[PDB]
Design a binder for this molecule. Sequence first.
Ligand code: HEM
Length: 180
Amino acid sequence: MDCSTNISPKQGLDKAKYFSGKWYVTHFLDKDPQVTDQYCSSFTPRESDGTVKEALYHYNANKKTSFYNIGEGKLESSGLQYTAKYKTVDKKKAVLKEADEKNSYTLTVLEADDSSALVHICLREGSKDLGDLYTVLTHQKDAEPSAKVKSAVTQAGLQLSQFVGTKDLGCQYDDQFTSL
Ligand code: HEM
């Protein structure tokens, strides 16, 4: 199960609303049913003159482990979308593994406002895709996305009822790592 070839970013999205503060994934939808583990994630994306760099955190709620990354790539000209290479870092942002250039993720922003966002992520490791991942984001963990962001979910052809809500997973975050 590959990522969809029909994802496009929303036009006219204010990149300012997206490359702001820290995001928490409040809801996620992974199209690949072969997965078991559920995750929490938070990240802090930043942009300058078309270059994006972001600090990323995952907590595996099933295995109770965590990992940290730094992603970097270039904004597409076309709309609010980038393919990043990523390194693996520790919680102090020291590099553990430099980027494997055969791996990337492409993040497409589908909606963004002052409180909330919807993005699609296609993670690729070499040959293999992880499959489509949609994440509803908010700045305040365990907050509800805005009506605008909820509408984007439906307009992406999805149903919010099918997303996993992270606020009930027993997530452990590292809010030190995502601040600034
Ligand atoms: C709750 C939301 C998320 C879920 C469920 C999820 C799920 C996963 C899973 C299952 C993996 C393991 C990949 C493997 O085993 O090789 C992974 C790794 C990864 N994810 Fe996510 N993810 C989430 C959020 C995000 C976000 C928001 C981003 C990008 C901004 C992202 C980027 C990555 C990257 C770069 C890896 C590391 C791949 C590697 O180690 O080579 N993820 N994620």
